[PDB]
Amino acid sequence: GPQYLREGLKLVLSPGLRLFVLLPLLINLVLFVGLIYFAGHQFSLLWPLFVVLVALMVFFTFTMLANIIAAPFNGFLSEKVEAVVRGVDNSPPFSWGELIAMVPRTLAREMRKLGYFLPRAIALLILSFIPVLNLVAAPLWLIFGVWMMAIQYIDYPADNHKLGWNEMLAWLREKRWQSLSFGGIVYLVLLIPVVNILMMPAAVAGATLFWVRE
Amino acid sequence: GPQYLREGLKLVLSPGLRLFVLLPLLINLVLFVGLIYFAGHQFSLWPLFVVLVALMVFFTFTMLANIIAAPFNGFLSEKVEAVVRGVDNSPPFSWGELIAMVPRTLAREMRKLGYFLPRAIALLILSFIPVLNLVAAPLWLIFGVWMMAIQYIDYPADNHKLGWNEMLAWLREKRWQSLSFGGIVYLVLLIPVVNILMMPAAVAGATLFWVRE
């Protein structure tokens, strides 16, 4: 179960994939470093509450944009990590221009993902401030959190092969244990603020692997 | 433990105290009704940003609510002492008396919030650290009960001149019964409707706390 993710690390490190692996890993890192540069300088440019608050704003918008921009790039590698473990062994000849074709579909999928996320995200936040109910908000956030990991990454290979919007989810439901496992371990590793930059493509690798073996 | 609070409910209903009981009970009631009127009309004028102004007006409303209803509590607090003590039932205290407490209660309240806000903000930051959140609400429950103890038990202990720290120390000296009183009081605070009546019952119970210990 975390083995999918580990093998995803093995494949993400494959010499043939390294182009397609390092491609979104560089735009993601400059954005990660691009954060603290913009956060250090501009964020400085009652009150404590408001500051923690707007900080959270910044974090939310930052995350959301990071995902919507890295969305197509992940969908691309998804096909390629599939290729490697499948027919076209290791390095598969895919050109740059290819990326142009995935732009509409991947972005549609991503925005659909955020439209699934936000309302349940808002519901859990509101449960988080009902003085005696809060005791179960965080464990709900956590479970909803890792299921949100599952669909986020298991969506890439299952969109490359045409699938309905709900259908994917239903399949995600049709085997909840392994989904929750994969999303789970990918979440645990997601926590680490440094190694995660490499583990995010490791994620989509493991997820394409996940559909391949199922 | 909650019997001191219940006894407060008995005292808060005593025919002699009904003046001093119905003094803050009306200004708090009109502020409770005054909340939803202003929130019904003005809030529309104002989703994440929406939830933002929402929580903002909620907790800021409670803040101004405390700094406004602060003097009236201290006033009643002196009476429930008197009532259960020497001057039985109705104790003859006139309106102008209040004027003497306004400077002290406000200088005590902003100290409570000075105590509260940074610990409040300390827990909020704890509530967004991914795997650590699992214990943020339990802390918030404990911290929320201890925030009821020092809220009300501070009234009679401020009538009898005590330091801001010293009170806390005494509250620390007997943690269990403090957490008890503040505990039940918090549990009754949750009720959105009955709390308006149990808010004055609480301070009565707290003076009772200072008295019986």
Residue numbers in the entry:
A (entry chain B): 8 to 52, 72 to 240
B (entry chain A): 8 to 53, 74 to 240
What does the study report here?
CysZ family members are 28–30 kDa bacterial inner-membrane proteins found exclusively in prokaryotes with no apparent homology to any of the established channel or transporter folds, and are scarcely studied in the literature. The CysZ protomer is an alpha-helical integral membrane protein with two long transmembrane (TM) helices (H2b and H3a) and two pairs of shorter helices (H4b-H5a and H7-H8) that insert only partially into the membrane (hemi-penetrating), forming a funnel or tripod-like shape within the membrane. The protein has an extra-membranous hydrophilic ‘head’, comprising an iris-like arrangement of the two short helices, H1 and H6, and kinked helices H3b, H4a, and H5b. Besides not resembling other transporter structures, CysZ mediates sulfate flux into cells or proteoliposomes without coupling to ion gradients, partner proteins, or exogenous energy sources such as ATP.
The structure of PfCysZ was solved second, to 3.5 Å resolution, with crystals also belonging to space group C2. Although PfCysZ and IlCysZ share 42% sequence identity, molecular replacement failed to find a convincing solution, and we instead used SeMet-derivatized PfCysZ to obtain phase information by multi-crystal SeMet SAD. Unlike PdCysZ, both IlCysZ and PfCysZ crystallize as dimers, in agreement with their different behavior in detergent-containing solution. The PfCysZ dimer is also arranged in an antiparallel orientation but with a different dimer interface. In the PfCysZ structure, helices H4b-H5a together form a narrower angle with helices H2 and H3, and tuck-in closer to the rest of the molecule. The resulting dumbbell-shaped PfCysZ dimer is predicted, by OPM/PPM (Orientation of Proteins in Membranes), to lie in the membrane at a 31° tilt to the perpendicular, in agreement with the position of its central hydrophobic belt, as revealed by surface-electrostatics calculations. On the other hand, the PfCysZ dimer resembles the transverse pair of protomers lying at a tilt, just as was predicted by OPM, along the side of the PdCysZ hexamer when viewed from inside the plane of the membrane. Disulfide-trapping experiments of the transverse dimer, performed by crosslinking a pair of mutants (L161C-A164C) on helix H5 of PfCysZ, as well as the corresponding pair in IlCysZ (V157C-Q163C) confirm the dimer interface observed in the structures of PfCysZ and IlCysZ, and, as a consequence, the antiparallel assembly of the two proteins. The ‘transverse’ dimer structure of PfCysZ clarified the possibility for ion permeation by showing that openings in its two protomers aligned across the putative membrane; however, the prospective transduction pathway would then be open on one side to the bilayer. In the case of IlCysZ and PfCysZ, this assembly may have come apart into the subsequently crystallized dimeric components during the process of detergent extraction from the membrane and purification.
